[PDB]
């Protein structure tokens, strides 16, 4: 299948070269896969979503999306029209307040819960949890999405935007999950990306276009932004069979487009999300 005037984002993760703009993907467009957003919730009844998202759990005193971020990295992973894996079901866990805030108790508990929850759900192809969002280390929250990737669930987590070594940063710095950094749309690493050993891959992070709150779009920036890239790519994957939760980071990396990204520090992987379409 082939979308045109996609966002630049979509047509360059189905691509060897920048500067396209047309997205190239199988039409089972990760169908009978799942992906948890963990953010600050989504607006499920976005015409975006088709009906395919909705929210599962909050820790506030409301489900719905005050804020925009959720929504829009929802959108990255799975609307209609700005989403790689455009048939996934999308599952909100609101974990961050309408500010865009979360104390780290809250955000551990919502990654256990999605290790639990995905018990509930319908998800034959495979689970997803998208994770853009983090802080300074913590050693718990590190193990809480170890566990999460533990229990079968592909765990993608932004680098986070301070431009300096993910090793400090949490979830970002635990090894066993799938750490994202940003590019821009002509194959520079984002001027604020997280860099560093733990990285295990890049994903379109500036000026990405999706989903926003009041039924609205637009386009900002992010490793947030590169994250669900990469989540909804592992969701698109998963559907065809060429990949597995425990196993879909290290096939992402395999499979990646090589040596094309400028201004990596030297140490760090030039690697950006490719998913090897032919039509
Ligand atoms: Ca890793």
């Given at each position: 299948?082939?979308?045109?005037?996609?966002?630049?984002?979509?047509?360059?993760?189905?691509?060897?070269?920048?500067?396209?703009?047309?997205?190239?993907?199988?039409?089972?467009?990760?169908?009978?896969?799942?992906?948890?957003?963990?953010?600050?919730?989504?607006?499920?009844?976005?015409?975006?979503?088709?009906?395919?998202?909705?929210?599962?759990?909050?820790?506030?005193?409301?489900?719905?999306?005050?804020?925009?971020?959720?929504?829009?990295?929802?959108?990255t992973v799975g609307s209609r029209t700005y989403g790689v894996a455009k048939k996934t079901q999308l599952f909100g866990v609101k974990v961050l307040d309408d500010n865009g805030s979360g104390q780290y108790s809250t955000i551990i508990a919502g990654m256990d819960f999605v290790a639990s929850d995905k018990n509930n759900r319908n998800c034959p192809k495979g689970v997803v949890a998208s994770l853009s969002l983090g802080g300074g280390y913590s050693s718990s929250v590190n193990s809480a999405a170890a566990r999460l990737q533990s229990s079968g669930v592909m765990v993608a987590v932004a680098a986070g935007n301070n431009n300096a070594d993910a090793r400090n940063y949490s979830p970002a710095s635990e090894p066993s999950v799938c750490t994202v950094g940003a590019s821009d749309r002509y194959?520079?690493?984002?001027?604020?990306?997280?860099?560093?050993?733990?990285?295990?891959?890049?994903?379109?992070?500036?000026?990405?276009?999706?989903?926003?709150?009041?039924?609205?779009?637009?386009?900002?920036?992010?490793?947030?932004?590169?994250?669900?890239?990469?989540?909804?790519?592992?969701?698109?994957?998963?559907?065809?069979?060429?990949?597995?939760?425990?196993?879909?980071?290290?096939?992402?990396?395999?499979?990646?487009?090589?040596?094309?990204?400028?201004?990596?520090?030297f140490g760090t992987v030039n690697l950006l999300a490719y998913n090897n379409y032919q039509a």
């Open positions: 299948a082939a979308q045109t005037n996609a966002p630049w984002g979509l047509a360059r993760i189905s691509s060897t070269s920048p500067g396209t703009s047309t997205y190239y993907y199988d039409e089972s467009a990760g169908q009978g896969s799942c992906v948890y957003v963990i953010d600050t919730g989504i607006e499920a009844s976005h015409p975006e979503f088709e009906g395919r998202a909705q929210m599962v759990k909050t820790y506030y005193y409301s489900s719905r999306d005050g804020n925009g971020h959720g929504t829009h990295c929802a959108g194959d520079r690493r984002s001027s604020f990306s997280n860099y560093g050993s733990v990285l295990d891959i890049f994903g379109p992070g500036t000026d990405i276009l999706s989903t926003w709150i009041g039924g609205s779009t637009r386009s900002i920036s992010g490793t947030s932004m590169a994250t669900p890239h990469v989540a909804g790519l592992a969701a698109y994957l998963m559907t065809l069979g060429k990949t597995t939760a425990a196993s879909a980071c290290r096939y992402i990396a395999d499979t990646a487009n090589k040596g094309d990204l400028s201004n990596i520090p």
